[model samples]
Target chain A: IQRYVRKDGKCNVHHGNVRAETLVFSTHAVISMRDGKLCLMFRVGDLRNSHIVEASIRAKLIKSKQTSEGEFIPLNQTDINVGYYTGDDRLFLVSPLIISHEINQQSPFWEISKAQLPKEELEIVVILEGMVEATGMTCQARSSYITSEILWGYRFTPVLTLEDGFYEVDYNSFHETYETSTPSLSAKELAELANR
Target chain B: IQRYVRKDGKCNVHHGNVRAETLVFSTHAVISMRDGKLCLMFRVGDLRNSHIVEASIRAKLIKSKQTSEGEFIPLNQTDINVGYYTGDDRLFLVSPLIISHEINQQSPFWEISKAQLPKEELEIVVILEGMVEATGMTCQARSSYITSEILWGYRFTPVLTLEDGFYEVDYNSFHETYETSTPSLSAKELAELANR
Candidate 1:
């Protein structure tokens, strides 16, 4: 199971099975810059290529904060956008679906980056839940990308294509990413530059 | 204008304009029973028949309660599901869009109904926000359905149809609804029956 995931953290796969059904998440759950905003993307499918029902995906930004009592606790968590890009929150997983989280000005990330990245403490967790087609039982897959694992200036390679009226997914390139040019300054600095 | 809306509260339209653009809502913002659960539906479009961009809709259930000092106030507000039924929260408004809110067991309505409807005070507020195409300015339209306006066993009539590769919306029937058979008992009573 561990061998299916990359050691560099560019992509990680959850090998757990729910109710004897394997929910395959076969791609890089990596962060990249799109339209000058931070974005997160991942792809998921079923091992048997069966349609997953009632599928929904969510992402949360988790951070630790210092309390007034001088204790450091992982208490701060905010829901980031998941499917607003596609105008929907539910996933149609008849084919591998690429879930996205676009970090816009309204997101907490806009303010958090100004205070500086919390180094090793910052975490972005993504969860996908749906019902197994054959068993009618709920199944969930989870993954997380830490501060270091986020590929700041990279985007996922397109893994889906239409051929002969059927959509095909190339799992070999599912986790593949290519670097793109983005601003070198932090999000806070970029905001300040725009203000000036 | 209030003249465009029905006095019976079957439908209400907002006549306000934003950035010189009239965001037209031409249908009933009524609640009905669907799949044994409460559902809210409404229709929205542009008067000029242009496409609306970045259109997102949200709904909230608001109720009032008495405080410790014996003063009643409308404080409790919970977000209800909006676009989960269509698998999208964003509305593509080339033609009129019928936004829906399905009140499932996970929604606040499920619990609130058990305690009985809060009489005439309960409000289901719906808001649709999007960008105006010509001016690139934000536009918002809002409406609320109180206890009296909700048609318990009714469903909205279909107002959209395809015509020669183009979709046409019949605004005349946008607010029209027909009755359907649903459980005669209150949600609370139905829950009890299932338990027994």
Candidate 2:
């Protein structure tokens, strides 16, 4: 029930106290459509002189069921797919990296619709591991998004651009999102509609 | 001396015989600017039902020198960096994947310019390994670009787009390139200029 990741993009994990020394993350996590597929994306700020050696996403879906004793059991859980977007395992975070998860038929959220979202419980955990060049030690940072933190029908605005012969990451737009048109039907329904 | 990868994008490695069954690649490999950094990119056609599990670029710079005996020695070789774009090791090939390599100061090509390119013997090799769902076997495809095949000041045309709520890859543009403005100086030269 505790929200480890904040809505304003402040994560619970911090590699350093100073703004220039810390590993920065997006203000919020969002669910958007990419290449016509539903996806969850988290924008990370560019580490000027540092890089992440390993990054991954772990997520799951939880549903409650009433037992004969009239008590709610939170044992119904399904693991979500989080590897396809980053190539199944490791992600290279040299620049501003967008950690993403594609929601397909194999994903736990494939059958869930906007109408069913309020009743379901979902969580996404992101883990970033690498060595800080300045500190000369390995550090791990983690952030999580609960059901309420997930924004639907929204797309993360472009935060990375090439200007004046260099790649620039606009932290000002890092947490920004724009409303976009998305299908009202679940992924399963859309797939079945295409078959017809 | 042997060209295993053709200009028409016909690779020496083929997993299947038919067009619908075989893995498709771009007509040619290109050197372009991405995020203001020089990069080597190869566009891959999406497999409708199949996907690549492992993909990597293995490249080394080869320079030949003449000995006193009038013999040419090709011992001067340096390993190139091909991990930053794909996050160090593996890449997920769900859609049209652009395998890219950033050419920075650390890159062997950092000091070479268009004028000096004619005298250098540079080569790049890309290896893609995955399973064909229909064939149920692991297959590997490889393509390479020698000095002559590498295109400078040219960018790969966009081939993937979302249309009618589905992702589409236009094979026609997969091999196309548009001339773009690039710095006339080498990466090292540019760095020196910036320092001054």
Candidate 3:
């Protein structure tokens, strides 16, 4: 279950020790169960594409995960998404692979080289470190950094393989169940789970 | 000399014209000089390519009034990009045109269709209207609503040309350009610009 994390690009926003090796770039991956097993079903390409991210994740999960161990047993079908957002601007989302994106240098929260991404493995990271509630929405799922992310962008990841594109590693450990994202909410509701 | 304006696709944003023939789709057209004149030099195939537009009117000073009065043998390399961009959220710079994007809901702002752009024109429309310029120094461009009739939302209009692959576009005259302006800014000067 080794997810060979490849940060083909730079992510100077969240993680440390970046800019040396695999710099985590890109954001928002939707995990769900397929044929009784967890699989990387969809990805938003950009965290700001939350609506698309939410919709794709919803389609992947068979149902809502009520329990971590019980609901996402084989990681086959499970509904999950960022249900909370903290417009704090600092408390944002970041992947284990993403780095600190320098807002001034075009460094992105997530990225992937244009060359390799077209070949294989696109990197993605969510900035959940300094977030705040969205402008208008009151719903948790809608509370995300959609507007801001669009404001400060670098480049988009490459290559899209939606038809039966499977990622064994992301499926094995990260069961895709974002439920329990917050103290009161599941990881699926990560964005909204905060602010409390 | 006369320039032929092509009406390929239909514009459908601010004013959705059912029978409105000018609802043209956006495409990339390179600008170049032909016969001591400035013209649109573009190619076709996909997002990464285009052919040309306004090639005939490159370098002829036939001030209007039919040159009979001989007062305004002016410039006439004039053309408008009229259309609407609904999908893809905002204007985007994309990779080469591929088979996947058969019916592009929102063609990348940076690229254009090959078939649409004729190959002998001048410069690429390096500028756009309605581009969301948040804070003037946020490092990048954002998407916004173009209100004026001059706003060429997600479209390009023939304007003066610059040397460094830039276009001296008015950006206000075109309707679609006003609808969804191009997204670009100094990613490096983000801090200093914000301070201003």
Candidate 4:
């Protein structure tokens, strides 16, 4: 039970493989909690339109910079869940989720969580930068959003539309609480978890 | 039902008054859409710790992008159904959604097709960045994995720890034919309306 503050492109990591251009446009990250730590994740374009997403979660505790609060040490080093998608026929994540069930293996993918998950999580989904027509219009752009539920709220996103070779996809979470469960919990529950 | 791609960021608006440093790490433009769009909904600084997460979501959508194929988009214009925590709680979005939300309604945030969202449709949740700890045994620090349902199938990411006061969040759309609706619609029916 906790609350998170809204923020912008909060990434400060100089990950070797993470290029500003690559991270700037057409990239995304997803997060989740495991072993009691938060997580962060990201994805990049593949051969063409398709791309990959990587996820993981972690945390760090260090000496307080405020000096005055040495009694209450500081926490650093964030955690996130990572993954990648080939965007080809793999129409699915190339790797298995920290806890995933195949669409085919299981009746549906919403069956992943039916119990209590860790208290930490994180996710990043970059709206690949470029010009594309959506809904009924066209334009140019660059942006990112928070789409993880285990780390944020409760809900699921829809699929992206591919037009004239263009790609469109929405990111989301199906953490049992969102709209994707058998008898999904209520938004109140989501609020409780969030406001906690 | 029609599919629409969303535009990122709004065309000059409310954010004009935001301090540059604060805005760089404020809510980002997630996705855009036709009648509706999507964006990462976030706030700042209320976590249980730097690792604690609160409410985060992908707003339905409130506006669209104007272009050659469209009209000149207006400033601060968004669909009613798409806004959440609006008026003071109003989210900052570009011309459209980071991901288009086919369903639009201010009161009804969104409307999933009877086929796609019949009854139990799907589930989603928000996640937070991961955290790292001093393993002591590892002679350094250790990280945890993202175990919350928010990340869905992804694992834990460790790169988020280096971020300052900013971070990123994303969305996911879970569409498992079997778990979405009641009595679950036929495969053809489910697939037919899922993207709607």
lDDT of 4 by residue, B8-105 (tens): 32222222222101111112211112111221122222221111111122322223346787676543233322223221112222211122122333
DockQ, all models: 0.02, 0.01, 0.01, 0.05
Write the residue-wise lDDT of candidate 1 on A1-196 in tens digits: 0111111111112222321446666445655555456556666664443445455778787888887999877657878787644334555344455565665576665644422543547777878876555554667888777776666556566665444433455777766767766555665557778887
Residue range B36-125, candidate 1, lDDT tens digits:
666656666644434457877766555554434332322234456776456466776655666766655666555444225435467555
Instruction: State the iRMSD of every prediction, in order shown.
Output: 24.4, 24.2, 26.1, 20.6
User: Of models 1 and 3, which has the larger lDDT?
Assistant: 1
| Candidate 1 vs 4: which has more lDDT | 1
lDDT of 3 by residue, A1-196 (tens): 3222346633332223322111122233332223322223222222321211111111111111122212111111211222212212222232322112221112221122222223331122121111112322211111111211221212223232222322212312321224311122222332233335
Worst 10 residues of 2 chain B by lDDT: B1-10
Question: Can you tell me the CAPRI class of model 4?
Answer: incorrect
- TM-score-superior candidate, 1 or 2: 2
User: Per-residue lDDT tens digits of candidate 4, residues A16-127?
Assistant: 2221112222222333332322223223322122123322111111111221212121222111112112222122221112221111111111123324323223122222
* TM-scores for every candidate against the unseen true structure: 0.44, 0.45, 0.18, 0.19
* Chain B TM-score by candidate, in order shown: 0.71, 0.74, 0.19, 0.19
Ranking by TM-score: 2, 1, 4, 3
Give lDDT: candidate 4, residue A103. 19
For model 3, what is the error of residue A21's alpha carbon versus the real structure, in angstroms, after optimal superposition?
24
Candidate 2 wrongly placed segments (more than 4 Å): A1-196, B1-20, B55-57, B60-78, B84-89
